[PDB]
CSV table of C-alpha atoms in Angstrom, one decimal:
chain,number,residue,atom,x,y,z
A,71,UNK,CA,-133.0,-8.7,-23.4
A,72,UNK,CA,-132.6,-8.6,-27.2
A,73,UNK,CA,-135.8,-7.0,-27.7
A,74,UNK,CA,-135.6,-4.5,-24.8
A,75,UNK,CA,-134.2,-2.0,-27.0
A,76,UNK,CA,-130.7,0.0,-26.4
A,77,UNK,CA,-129.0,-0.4,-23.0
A,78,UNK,CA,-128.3,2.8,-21.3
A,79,UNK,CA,-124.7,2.7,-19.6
A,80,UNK,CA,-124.6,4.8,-16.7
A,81,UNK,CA,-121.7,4.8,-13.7
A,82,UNK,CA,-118.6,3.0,-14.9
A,83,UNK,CA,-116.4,1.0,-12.2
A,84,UNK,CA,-112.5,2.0,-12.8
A,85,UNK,CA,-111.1,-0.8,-15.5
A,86,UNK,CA,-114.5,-2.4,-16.1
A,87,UNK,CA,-115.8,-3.7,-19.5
A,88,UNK,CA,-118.3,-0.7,-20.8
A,89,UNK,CA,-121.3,-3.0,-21.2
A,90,UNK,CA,-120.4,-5.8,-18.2
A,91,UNK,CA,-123.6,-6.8,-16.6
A,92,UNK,CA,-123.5,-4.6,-13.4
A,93,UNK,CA,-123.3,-1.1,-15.2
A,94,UNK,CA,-127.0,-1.3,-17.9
A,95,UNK,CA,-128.8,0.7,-15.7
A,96,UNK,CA,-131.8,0.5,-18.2
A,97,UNK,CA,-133.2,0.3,-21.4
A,98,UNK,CA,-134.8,2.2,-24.2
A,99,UNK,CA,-136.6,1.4,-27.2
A,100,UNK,CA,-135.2,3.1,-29.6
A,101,UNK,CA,-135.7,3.5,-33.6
A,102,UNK,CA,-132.8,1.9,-35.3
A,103,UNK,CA,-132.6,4.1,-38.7
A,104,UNK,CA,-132.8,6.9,-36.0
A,105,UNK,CA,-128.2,7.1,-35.8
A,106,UNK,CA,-126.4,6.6,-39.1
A,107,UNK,CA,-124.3,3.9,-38.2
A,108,UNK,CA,-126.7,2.3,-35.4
A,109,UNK,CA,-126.5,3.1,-32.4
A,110,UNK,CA,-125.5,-0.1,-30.3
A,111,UNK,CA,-125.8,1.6,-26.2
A,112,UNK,CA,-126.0,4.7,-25.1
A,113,UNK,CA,-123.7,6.5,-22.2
A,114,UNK,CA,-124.6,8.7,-20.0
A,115,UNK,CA,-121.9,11.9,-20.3
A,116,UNK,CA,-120.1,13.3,-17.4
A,117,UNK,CA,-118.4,16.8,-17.2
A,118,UNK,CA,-118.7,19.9,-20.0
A,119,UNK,CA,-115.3,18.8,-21.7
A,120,UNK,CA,-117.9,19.3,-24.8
A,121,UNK,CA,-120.5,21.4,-24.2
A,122,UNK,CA,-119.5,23.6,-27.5
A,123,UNK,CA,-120.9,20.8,-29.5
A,124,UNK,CA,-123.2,20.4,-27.4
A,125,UNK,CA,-123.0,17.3,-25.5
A,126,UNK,CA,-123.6,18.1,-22.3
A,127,UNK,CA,-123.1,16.9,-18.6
A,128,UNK,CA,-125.7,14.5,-17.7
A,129,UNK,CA,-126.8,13.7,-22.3
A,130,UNK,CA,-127.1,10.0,-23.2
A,131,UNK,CA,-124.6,9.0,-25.8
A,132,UNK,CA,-125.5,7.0,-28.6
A,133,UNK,CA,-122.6,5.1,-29.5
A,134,UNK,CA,-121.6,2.6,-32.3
A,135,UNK,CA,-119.5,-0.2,-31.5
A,136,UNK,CA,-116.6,-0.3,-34.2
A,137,UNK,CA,-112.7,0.4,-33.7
A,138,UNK,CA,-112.7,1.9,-36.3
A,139,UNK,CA,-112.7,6.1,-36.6
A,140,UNK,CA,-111.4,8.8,-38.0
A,141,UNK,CA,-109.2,11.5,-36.7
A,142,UNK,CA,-111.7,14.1,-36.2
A,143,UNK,CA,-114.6,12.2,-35.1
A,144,UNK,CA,-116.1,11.9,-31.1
A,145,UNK,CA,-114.2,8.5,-30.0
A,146,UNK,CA,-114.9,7.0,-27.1
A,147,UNK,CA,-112.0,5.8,-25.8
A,148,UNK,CA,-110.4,4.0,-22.8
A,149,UNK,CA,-106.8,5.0,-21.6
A,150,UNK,CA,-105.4,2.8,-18.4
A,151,UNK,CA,-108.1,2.8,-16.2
A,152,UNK,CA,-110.5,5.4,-17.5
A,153,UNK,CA,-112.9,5.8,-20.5
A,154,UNK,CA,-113.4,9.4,-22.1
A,155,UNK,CA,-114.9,11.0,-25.2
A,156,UNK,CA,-113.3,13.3,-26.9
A,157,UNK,CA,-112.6,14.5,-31.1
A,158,UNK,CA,-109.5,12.3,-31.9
A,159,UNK,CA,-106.5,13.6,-33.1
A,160,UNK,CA,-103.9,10.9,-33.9
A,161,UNK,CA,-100.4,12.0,-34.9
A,162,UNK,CA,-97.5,9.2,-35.5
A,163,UNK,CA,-97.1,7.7,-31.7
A,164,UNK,CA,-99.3,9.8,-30.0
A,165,UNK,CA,-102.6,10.5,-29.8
A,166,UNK,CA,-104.7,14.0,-28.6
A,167,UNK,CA,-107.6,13.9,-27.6
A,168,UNK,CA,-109.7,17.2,-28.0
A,169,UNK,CA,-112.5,18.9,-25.4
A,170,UNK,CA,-115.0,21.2,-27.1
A,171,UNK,CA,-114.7,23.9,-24.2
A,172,UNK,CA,-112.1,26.2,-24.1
A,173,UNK,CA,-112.1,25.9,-20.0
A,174,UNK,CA,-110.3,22.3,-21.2
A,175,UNK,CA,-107.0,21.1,-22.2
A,176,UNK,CA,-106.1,18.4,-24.8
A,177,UNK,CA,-105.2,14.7,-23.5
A,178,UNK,CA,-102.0,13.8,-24.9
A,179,UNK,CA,-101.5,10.3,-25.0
A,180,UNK,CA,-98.2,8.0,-25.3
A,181,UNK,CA,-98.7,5.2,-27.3
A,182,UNK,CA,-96.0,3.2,-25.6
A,183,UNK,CA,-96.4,4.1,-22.5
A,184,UNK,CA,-100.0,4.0,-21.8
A,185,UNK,CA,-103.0,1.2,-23.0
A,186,UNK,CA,-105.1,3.3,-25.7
A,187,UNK,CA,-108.1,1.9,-27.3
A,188,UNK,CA,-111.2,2.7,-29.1
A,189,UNK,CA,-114.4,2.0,-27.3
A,190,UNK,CA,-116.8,3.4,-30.5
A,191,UNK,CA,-118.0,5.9,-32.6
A,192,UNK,CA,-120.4,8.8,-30.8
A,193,UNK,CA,-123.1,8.8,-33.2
A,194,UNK,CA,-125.8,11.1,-31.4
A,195,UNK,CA,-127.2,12.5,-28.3
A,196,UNK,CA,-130.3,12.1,-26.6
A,197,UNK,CA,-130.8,14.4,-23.8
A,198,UNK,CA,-134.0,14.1,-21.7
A,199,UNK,CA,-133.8,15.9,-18.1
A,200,UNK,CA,-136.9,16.9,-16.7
A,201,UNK,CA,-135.8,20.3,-16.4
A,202,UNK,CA,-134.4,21.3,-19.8
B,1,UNK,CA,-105.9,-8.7,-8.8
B,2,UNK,CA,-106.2,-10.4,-12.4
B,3,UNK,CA,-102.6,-11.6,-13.9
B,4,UNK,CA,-102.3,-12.1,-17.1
B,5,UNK,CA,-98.9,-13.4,-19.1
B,6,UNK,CA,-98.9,-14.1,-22.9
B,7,UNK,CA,-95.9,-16.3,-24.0
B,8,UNK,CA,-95.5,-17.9,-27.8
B,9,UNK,CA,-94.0,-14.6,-29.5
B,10,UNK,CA,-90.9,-15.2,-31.7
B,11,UNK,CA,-90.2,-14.4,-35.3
B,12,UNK,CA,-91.7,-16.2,-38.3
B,13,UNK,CA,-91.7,-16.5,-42.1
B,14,UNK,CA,-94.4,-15.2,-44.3
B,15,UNK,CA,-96.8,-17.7,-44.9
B,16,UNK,CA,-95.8,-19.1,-41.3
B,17,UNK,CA,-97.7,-20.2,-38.5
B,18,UNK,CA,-97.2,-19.1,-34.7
B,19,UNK,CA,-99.5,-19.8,-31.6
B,20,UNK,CA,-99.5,-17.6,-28.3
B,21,UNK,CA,-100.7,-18.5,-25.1
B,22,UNK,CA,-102.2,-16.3,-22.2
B,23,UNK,CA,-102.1,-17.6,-18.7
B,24,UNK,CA,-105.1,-16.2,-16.2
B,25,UNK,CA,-104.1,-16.0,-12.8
B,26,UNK,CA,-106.5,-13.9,-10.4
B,27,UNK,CA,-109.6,-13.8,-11.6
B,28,UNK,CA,-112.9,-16.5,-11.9
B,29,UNK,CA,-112.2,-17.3,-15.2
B,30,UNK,CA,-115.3,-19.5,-16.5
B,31,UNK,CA,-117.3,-15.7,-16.1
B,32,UNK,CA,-114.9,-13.5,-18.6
B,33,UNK,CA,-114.5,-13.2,-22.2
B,34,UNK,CA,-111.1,-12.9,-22.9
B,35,UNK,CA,-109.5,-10.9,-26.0
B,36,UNK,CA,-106.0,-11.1,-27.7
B,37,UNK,CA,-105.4,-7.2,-28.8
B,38,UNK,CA,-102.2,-5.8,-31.1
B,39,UNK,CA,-100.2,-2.8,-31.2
B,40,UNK,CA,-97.7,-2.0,-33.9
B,41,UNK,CA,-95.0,0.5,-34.4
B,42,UNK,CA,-96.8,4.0,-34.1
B,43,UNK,CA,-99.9,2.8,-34.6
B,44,UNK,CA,-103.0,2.7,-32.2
B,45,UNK,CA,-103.5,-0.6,-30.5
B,46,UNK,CA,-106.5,-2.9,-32.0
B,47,UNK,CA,-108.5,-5.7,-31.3
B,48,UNK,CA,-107.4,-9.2,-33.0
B,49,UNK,CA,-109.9,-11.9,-31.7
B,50,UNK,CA,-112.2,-12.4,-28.8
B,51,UNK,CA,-113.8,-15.4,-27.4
B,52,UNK,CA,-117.2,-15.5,-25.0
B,53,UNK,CA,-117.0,-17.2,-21.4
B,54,UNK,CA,-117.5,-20.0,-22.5
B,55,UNK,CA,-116.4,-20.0,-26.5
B,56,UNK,CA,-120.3,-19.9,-28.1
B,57,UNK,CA,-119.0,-16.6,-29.7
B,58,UNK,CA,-116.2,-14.4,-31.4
B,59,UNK,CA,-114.8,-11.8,-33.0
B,60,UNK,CA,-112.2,-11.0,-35.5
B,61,UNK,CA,-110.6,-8.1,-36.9
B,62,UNK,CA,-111.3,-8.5,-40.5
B,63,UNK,CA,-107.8,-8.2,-41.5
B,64,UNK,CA,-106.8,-11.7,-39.8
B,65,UNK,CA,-110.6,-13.5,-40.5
B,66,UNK,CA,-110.0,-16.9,-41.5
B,67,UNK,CA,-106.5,-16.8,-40.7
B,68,UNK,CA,-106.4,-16.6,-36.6
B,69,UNK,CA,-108.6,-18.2,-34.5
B,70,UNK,CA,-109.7,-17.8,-30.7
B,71,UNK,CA,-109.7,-20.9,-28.6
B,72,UNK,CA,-109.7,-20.7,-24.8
B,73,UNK,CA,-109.5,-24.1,-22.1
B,74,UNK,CA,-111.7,-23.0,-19.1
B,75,UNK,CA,-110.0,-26.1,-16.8
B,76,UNK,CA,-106.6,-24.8,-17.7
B,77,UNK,CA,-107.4,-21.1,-17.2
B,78,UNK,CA,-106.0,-20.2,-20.6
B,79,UNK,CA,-106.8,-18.5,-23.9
B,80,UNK,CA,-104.3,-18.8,-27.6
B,81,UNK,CA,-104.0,-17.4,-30.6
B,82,UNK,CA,-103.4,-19.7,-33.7
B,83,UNK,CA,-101.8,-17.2,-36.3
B,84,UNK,CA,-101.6,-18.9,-39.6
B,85,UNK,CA,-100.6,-17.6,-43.0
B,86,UNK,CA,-98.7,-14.8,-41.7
B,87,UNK,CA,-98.2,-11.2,-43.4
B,88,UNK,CA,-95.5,-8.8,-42.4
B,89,UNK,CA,-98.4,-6.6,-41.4
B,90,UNK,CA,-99.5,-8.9,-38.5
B,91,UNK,CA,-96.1,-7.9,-37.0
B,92,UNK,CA,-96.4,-6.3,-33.3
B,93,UNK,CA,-96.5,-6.9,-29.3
B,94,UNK,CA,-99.5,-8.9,-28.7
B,95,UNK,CA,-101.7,-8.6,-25.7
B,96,UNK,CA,-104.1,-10.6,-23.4
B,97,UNK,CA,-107.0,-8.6,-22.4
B,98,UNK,CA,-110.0,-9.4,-19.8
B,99,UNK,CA,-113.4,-8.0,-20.9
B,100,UNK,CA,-117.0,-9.5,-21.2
B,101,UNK,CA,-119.4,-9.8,-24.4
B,102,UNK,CA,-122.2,-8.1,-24.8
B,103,UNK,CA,-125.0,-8.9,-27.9
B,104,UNK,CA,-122.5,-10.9,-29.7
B,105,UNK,CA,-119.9,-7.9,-29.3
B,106,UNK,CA,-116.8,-8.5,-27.1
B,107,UNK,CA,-116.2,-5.2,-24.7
B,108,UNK,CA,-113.0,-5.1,-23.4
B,109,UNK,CA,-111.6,-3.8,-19.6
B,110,UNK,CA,-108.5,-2.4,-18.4
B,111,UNK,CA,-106.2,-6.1,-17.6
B,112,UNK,CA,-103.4,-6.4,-19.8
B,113,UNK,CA,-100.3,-9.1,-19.9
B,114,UNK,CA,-97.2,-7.4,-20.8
B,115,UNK,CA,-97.1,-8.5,-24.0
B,116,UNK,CA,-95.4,-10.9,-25.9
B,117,UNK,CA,-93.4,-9.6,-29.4
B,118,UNK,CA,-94.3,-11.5,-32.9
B,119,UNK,CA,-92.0,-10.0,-35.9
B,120,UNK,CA,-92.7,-11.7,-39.5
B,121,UNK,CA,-90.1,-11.3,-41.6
B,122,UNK,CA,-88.3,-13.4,-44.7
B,123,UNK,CA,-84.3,-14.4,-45.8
């Protein structure tokens, strides 16, 4: 499975590891020097929270598995049950999380009373719909 | 319907040593990696070890490597987290998490004990 190339990590049962078994929906072999740092899966993107970047419904996420980022950079992050991506904006205790779409409001997260946690790093975006 | 209590917190010396415990309760345990996490004052809430299913792999923050380790005890249903040599930094609620590895990389879920407090401080 090694070989196979990056997992693609589609539909995401509520509370779920991101990779668990049950959610690699495929594969694809893709160049390694292609992200800077490598791309480890990729995840599919739901909603226009940040279509002003351009990372639109329906894009494949490359993502790099760290916990370690920068305020400013796409996180992809998991909060209670759910798993978003957003540009992070931490700030003491709490933590925004920003849509790039005006139609969209910042997530503001409590540190202590909500589970917050880094998932990765977005490092690129593969789109490949057959009608463009 | 997966329970999860971590016990072993207290307060410790620099330099000290300090083991935590998680108990697993509703889950098939033998099929889950299993992850101690941290969070500090203020401060976003990280990943301090995982351990496979089974224990053929971990991780480590690199701030605790080569002082914490992961074991888990699949008959017991179990996971702990030896803390040796410890810094005032490693100071902060410590949580059991249930997640699976994937190409050597633990990824965690959404199960979390409520957390059991570890304060290093001297006299």
């Amino acid at each position: 499975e090694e070989e196979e190339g990056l997992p693609l990590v589609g539909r995401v049962a509520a509370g779920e590891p991101l990779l668990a078994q049950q959610h690699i929906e495929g594969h694809y072999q893709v160049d390694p020097s292609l992200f800077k740092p490598n791309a480890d899966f990729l995840l599919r993107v739901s909603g226009m929270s940040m279509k002003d970047i351009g990372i639109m419904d329906g894009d494949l996420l490359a993502v790099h598995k760290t916990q370690d980022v920068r305020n400013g950079q796409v996180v992809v992050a998991r909060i209670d049950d759910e798993v978003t991506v957003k540009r992070l904006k931490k700030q003491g205790n709490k933590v925004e999380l920003l849509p790039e779409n005006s139609e969209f409001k910042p997530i503001v997260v409590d540190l202590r009373q909500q589970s917050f946690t880094i998932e990765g790093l977005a490092v690129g975006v593969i789109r490949n719909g057959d009608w463009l | 319907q997966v329970q999860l209590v971590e016990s072993g917190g207290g307060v410790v010396q620099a330099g000290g040593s300090l083991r935590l415990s998680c108990a697993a309760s509703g889950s098939i345990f033998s099929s889950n990696a299993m992850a101690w996490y941290r969070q500090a004052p203020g401060n976003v809430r990280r990943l301090v070890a995982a351990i496979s299913s089974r224990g053929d792999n971990t991780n480590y923050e690199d701030s605790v490597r080569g002082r914490f380790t992961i074991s888990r005890d699949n008959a017991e249903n179990t996971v702990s987290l030896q803390m040796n040599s410890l810094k005032p930094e490693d100071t902060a609620i410590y949580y059991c998490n249930v997640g699976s590895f994937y190409r050597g990389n633990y990824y965690g879920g959404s199960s979390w004990g409520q957390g059991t407090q570890v304060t290093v401080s001297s006299h």
